[PDB]
Amino acid sequence: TSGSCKGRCFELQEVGPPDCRCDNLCKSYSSCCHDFDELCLKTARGWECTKDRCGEVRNEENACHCSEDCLSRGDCCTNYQVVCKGESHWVDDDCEEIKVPECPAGFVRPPLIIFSVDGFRASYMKKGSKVMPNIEKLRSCGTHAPYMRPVYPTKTFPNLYTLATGLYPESHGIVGNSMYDPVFDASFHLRGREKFNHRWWGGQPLWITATKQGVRAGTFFWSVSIPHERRILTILQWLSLPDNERPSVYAFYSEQPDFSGHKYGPFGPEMTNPLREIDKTVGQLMDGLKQLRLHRCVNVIFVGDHGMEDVTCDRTEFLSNYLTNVDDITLVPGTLGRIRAKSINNSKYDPKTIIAALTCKKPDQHFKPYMKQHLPKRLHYANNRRIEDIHLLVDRRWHVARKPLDVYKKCFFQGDHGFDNKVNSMQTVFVGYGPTFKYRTKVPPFENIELYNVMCDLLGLKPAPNNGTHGSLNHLLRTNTFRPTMPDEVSRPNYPGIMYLQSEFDLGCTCDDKVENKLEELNKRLHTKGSTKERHLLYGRPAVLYRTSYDILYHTDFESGYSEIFLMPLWTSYTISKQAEVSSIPEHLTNCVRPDVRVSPGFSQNCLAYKNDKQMSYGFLFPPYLSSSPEAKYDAFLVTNMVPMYPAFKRVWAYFQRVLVKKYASERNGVNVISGPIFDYNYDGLRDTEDEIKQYVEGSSIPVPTHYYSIITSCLDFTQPADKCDGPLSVSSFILPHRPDNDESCNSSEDESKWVEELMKMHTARVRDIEHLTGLDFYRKTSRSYSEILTLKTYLHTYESE
Ligand SMILES: *[C@@H]1O[C@H](CO)[C@@H](O[C@@H]2O[C@H](CO)[C@@H](O[C@@H]3O[C@H](CO[C@H]4O[C@H](CO)[C@@H](O)[C@H](O[C@H]5O[C@H](CO)[C@@H](O)[C@H](O)[C@@H]5O[C@H]5O[C@H](CO)[C@@H](O)[C@H](O)[C@@H]5O)[C@@H]4O)[C@@H](O)[C@H](O[C@H]4O[C@H](CO)[C@@H](O)[C@H](O)[C@@H]4O[C@H]4O[C@H](CO)[C@@H](O)[C@H](O)[C@@H]4O)[C@@H]3O)[C@H](O)[C@H]2NC(C)=O)[C@H](O)[C@H]1NC(C)=O
Ligand SMILES: CC(C)(C)C(=O)Nc1cc(C#N)ccc1COC(=O)N1C[C@@H]2CN(C(=O)c3ccc4[nH]nnc4c3)C[C@H]2C1
Ligand SMILES: CC(C)(C)C(=O)Nc1cc(C#N)ccc1COC(=O)N1C[C@@H]2CN(C(=O)c3ccc4[nH]nnc4c3)C[C@H]2C1
Ligand SMILES: [Ca+2]
Ligand SMILES: [K+]
Ligand code: NA
Ligand SMILES: [Zn+2]
């Protein structure tokens, strides 16, 4: 470490060791040159020009300069021009639209500066507005969302690395603020050097995507000791490098307001200061850019990782209050719980009994236990060996801790984060400002997984495969690199006619249906042939994006895509107008299941299988309850409308079909509903192939769904009915887990009106989540632009307050 940093402070291109370093990571590696702080971390005279300093003789020891050569040397204090040249601060200037990039010669593309702020809760934009004039100018003049949804867990590393990669934590591998990997036999902590081993960090983050494609990056790590002022001056110096050396993408990171927020709560009186400070740093950057003539050239993204909630020690739940075998578990504690065996050499560890002991045990309990595969699918928090089989979702405002000793042998804090990512307090911020973003534009809330695609667009890069839906944020941008196209249908449907006689079927099924007009039979003929298909299929048939064998089946009240491989529909589509009336399954038709004369015995389910199977009953995708007439109801009992359902789950499903659909049709002015099965036995969030199914209705080839979905669409303008909508659509969807019990809902021994809807809300989902899980592609035929449809497909209905 004997070498010098002279003239190589914060050098971008790296050197070969044991040879001393001068970059942000050097303190962490103990590899800094002995003159690092002296040369690279000057502080003399502070950060601002004062009037007396103007035009001075250059003293190389000052932190920044007011000397005449400073603009060209690229190292003035950010307020130099204001003080020494009578320029105005960036914030005081009117905002003027940036129609085209106004860049100095040599700039091949507008730079991107990612200004990331830790714990910057969405509502600070309104609530701290009086003290954040620079940020508020960015926000009102550029493009902003009311809030941006983080990913689960709403911790710092999982979310910054999601921003950088477009990946769910389960895919990028940073699934928590601390992690045990069972194959590394290693722990990853906020403290320590293990976290610096590359083996934890999957996917391809923006700085690597940028390099691999010939675009240079400034640092995406800043030392905690390096003050924010020196961080801004470093970015400003790099922006003054020669064309061949100068990076195109930059990052800034603020520890605030998160650092304070943990101490004082999200709205503690001590929070106003951190917000003033962040604002001042933004002011410095914008003043700096304006000096360099870059303030109408650079795209600036102001983005937070997660919000902040009120959490205190006395609001902790202790596992020792639930389990007696509390010493046989390791818990990752806090705003989420992850339990594994304290030792794998122990074959006396039983997760089922742990779960059981943690379920609805206290009238008011503030967490809920889940096997990871049972977590709401919208959290995408299962497909990683680092995520423990046992998970606890903790209520907002609470903590889980193992024993009382852990909170008083380790009250300090008033704020925390990490809860479910639909929680209002966890929402964070997005503002984009620059030539490539729109002018004075509000966009709807979106998920942070979408940004990697946009940052690649902004930089002319081709994104690595990721979890955003590329095009879903084209409406943020003035000019678009990416023009999305609908994927091609892989399998085209069959359209079978009447090909089988009743007596050919031997399904163990029975129906009371043999009751004694010519016009009446041509009417019904037109039905089985797609007459009301434009009423029940409002957005075109979904496209199957994989290779398979399936039949389109028309009926009076509904239309389906019936899979000959899975022996049940992939999808069933139907419209319930506001006027539509509910009826009951008449008594003689309770056990009614009818063969479908369009589909072979061999590609049909049978009732026998359901008899012999003591666990499994069955339900219907189009609900009998909602048939338009007594004759049409017979359609609802076709064996091709049937699906396997646990009796426990039928309680949920029956309430949704009998009560909730009609309610939605009344509130929304008609709804269109597409429901179907989902198979995700390997919990990867993607459609299972046949050979992945772990469970069949006993002694049959009838596969059992892990989940059931519905997509419920209507007109955004609810003065128009769902079936005659001229403009933007409105959607909400869910993916309900197909479970043999209702342990998840503590009050399920009450009437369905007390719990079912609360459960469905918990399992709300994006249409895009259902697409991954089914291999289907929806909304193929609408009057809407494809970009708008992508936005709709990424929409999540969250059921939170405002
Ligand atoms: C969100 O977006 C992401 C990104 O697009 C989606 O994830 C992708 O999904 C693909 C499908 O699951 C998957 O493709 C597979 O890749 C296998 C090789 O994987 C390596 O290479 C890639 C490319 O560089 C790399 O990204 C991978 O990185 C993973 O693994 C390491 C750890 O080992 C981590 O550093 C990293 O975080 C990442 O981990 C994640 O992925 C793995 C699985 O890949 C998970 O297990 C982890 O939990 C974690 O989430 C890897 O370095 C490739 O071998 C596969 O090919 C198999 O299948 C094809 C079918 O086409 C077939 O030709 C072969 O038979 C082959 O099977 C053989 O191997 C089997 C497995 O051992 C064996 O059982 C068989 O018998 C066969 O011998 C496959 O193509 C892709 O890797 C990931 N990418 C990422 C970044 O995660 C994700 O699905 C999206 N999510 C949603 C909800 O939509
Ligand atoms: C992997 C990495 C470097 C974190 C990353 O992706 N960074 C990235 C991507 C983009 C983007 N896109 C934009 C900016 C960046 C900026 O990163 C950085 O300089 N750092 C962020 C780390 C946060 N941190 C903590 O110790 C911490 C831990 C637990 C906490 N709870 N509550 N507050 C916490 C703070 C050290 C800071 C170093
Ligand atoms: C630069 C980057 C990748 C954004 C980063 O710092 N990421 C990050 C932030 C935090 C934190 N906090 C925690 C973990 C991570 C992820 O780590 C990684 O994947 N890597 C970082 C290692 C740095 N490195 C070097 O050879 C090196 C470079 C510069 C040096 N100066 N002095 N000694 C040095 C040694 C190989 C990189 C692999
Ligand atoms: Ca799957
Ligand atoms: K049964
Ligand atoms: Na229950
Ligand atoms: Zn924090």
Residue nearest to atom 13 of ligand 3 (CA): 196
Q: Which of 382, 443, 465, 447 is nearest to 159 (CA)?
A: 447
In sequence order, the 6+-apart residues with CB closer than 8 A to the CB of 451 are 163, 166, 301, 303, 430, 468, 473
**Cα distances (angstroms) measured from residue 644 to each of 178, 345, 660, 690:** 40, 39, 21, 16
Q: 785 is written with which tokens?
A: 């632009």
Q: Return d(Cα 730, Cα 115) in angstroms, integer.
A: 33
**Helix H or strand E encompassing 736:** strand 729-737
Question: C-alpha angle 802/767/618, rounded to 5°?
Answer: 110
Count of C-beta atoms within a 10 Å radius of residue 716: 14
Question: C-alpha angle 745/747/752, rounded to 5°?
Answer: 90
Q: 436 is written with which tokens?
A: 């490539």
Give the closest ligand to the alpha carbon of residue 205: 2
CB 401 within 8 A of CB 115: no
In sequence order, the 6+-apart residues with CB closer than 8 A to the CB of 208 are none
Q: Which of 18, 276, 22 is nearest to 128 (CA)?
A: 276
**DSSP-based three-state secondary structure for 242:** coil
| Experiment type | X-ray
Question: C-alpha angle 694/696/697, rounded to 5°?
Answer: 155
- What is the number of the ligand 1 atom nearest to the C-alpha of 202? 37
Q: 75 is written with which tokens?
A: 């190292």
Q: Return d(Cα 744, Cα 590) in angstroms, integer.
A: 29
Q: Which of 762, 765, 745, 741 is nearest to 754 (CA)?
A: 745
Q: Return d(Cα 386, Cα 364) in angstroms, integer.
A: 30
List b or e across 26-60, with b for residues whose CB sees 16 or more CB atoms inside 10 angstroms. Answer: bbeeebbbeebeebbbbeebebbbeeebeeeeeee
**Residue 619's Cα: distance from chain center in Å?**
31
Q: 158 is written with which tokens?
A: 């999982």
**Cα distances (angstroms) measured from residue 243 to each of 103, 218, 247:** 12, 14, 9
Q: Which long-range contacts (CB under 8 A, 24 or more apart) does 291-295 make?
A: 291/71, 291/76, 291/78, 291/80, 291/81, 291/87, 292/71, 292/74, 292/104, 292/236, 292/239, 292/240, 293/102, 293/104, 294/103, 294/104, 294/111, 294/239, 295/90
Task: Give the position of tokens 């020009």.
Answer: 49
Residue type, position 30, single letter: S
SS3 per-residue string spanning 112-166: EEEEEEECCECCHHHHCHHHCHHHHHHHHHCEEEEEEECCCCCCHHHHHHHHHHC
Q: Is the CB of 173 under 6 A from ligand 1?
A: yes
Pocket lining for ligand 3, CB < 6 angstroms: 14, 21, 23, 25-26, 29, 31, 195-196, 198, 201, 220-221
In sequence order, the 6+-apart residues with CB closer than 8 A to the CB of 411 are 312, 313, 314
Q: Which of 580, 702, 569 is nearest to 636 (CA)?
A: 569
Task: Give the position of tokens 């359901």.
Answer: 610
| Å from CA of 700 to ligand 5 middle | 13
Q: Which DSSP string do the residues of 311-363 spell out, in sequence order?
A: --GGGEEEGGGT-S-GGGEEEE-BSEEEEEES-TT-TT--HHHHHHHHSS-ST
CB 637 within 8 A of CB 560: no
CB 637 within 8 A of CB 511: yes
**Residue 105's Cα: distance from chain center in Å?**
40
Q: What are phi and psi of 412, to 5 degrees?
A: -80, -45
Residue type, position 156, single letter: T
**Cα distances (angstroms) measured from residue 525 to each of 554, 628, 725:** 10, 16, 28
Q: Return d(Cα 374, Cα 390) in angstroms, integer.
A: 10
Q: What are phi and psi of 580, to 5 degrees?
A: -55, 140
Question: C-alpha angle 731/732/737, rounded to 5°?
Answer: 145
Q: Is the CB of 160 under 6 A from ligand 2?
A: yes
Q: Return d(Cα 27, Cα 9) in angstroms, integer.
A: 13
Annotated binding site: 118, 156, 177, 258, 262, 305-306, 417, 680, 682, 684, 686, 688
HSE, side-chain direction, 13 A CA sphere, residue 580 = 29
Catalytic (active site) residue 1: no
Residues in a beta bridge with 446: 148
Q: Which DSSP string do the residues of 533-575 spell out, in sequence order?
A: HHHH-SS-PPEE-S---EEEEE-SS-EEEEETTTTEEEEEEEE
Residue type, position 96, single letter: E
E strand map for 566-702? 568-576, 617-620, 642-645, 671-678
CB 232 within 8 A of CB 10: no
Q: Return d(Cα 551, Cα 564) in angstroms, integer.
A: 7
**Helix H or strand E encompassing 369:** strand 367-371
Q: Return d(Cα 495, Cα 562) in angstroms, integer.
A: 10
Q: Which of 251, 684, 702 is nearest to 451 (CA)?
A: 251
Count of C-beta atoms within a 10 Å radius of residue 698: 15
List b or e across 391-415, with b for residues whose CB sees 16 or more CB atoms inside 10 angstroms. Answer: bbbbbbbbbbbbbeeebeeeeeebb
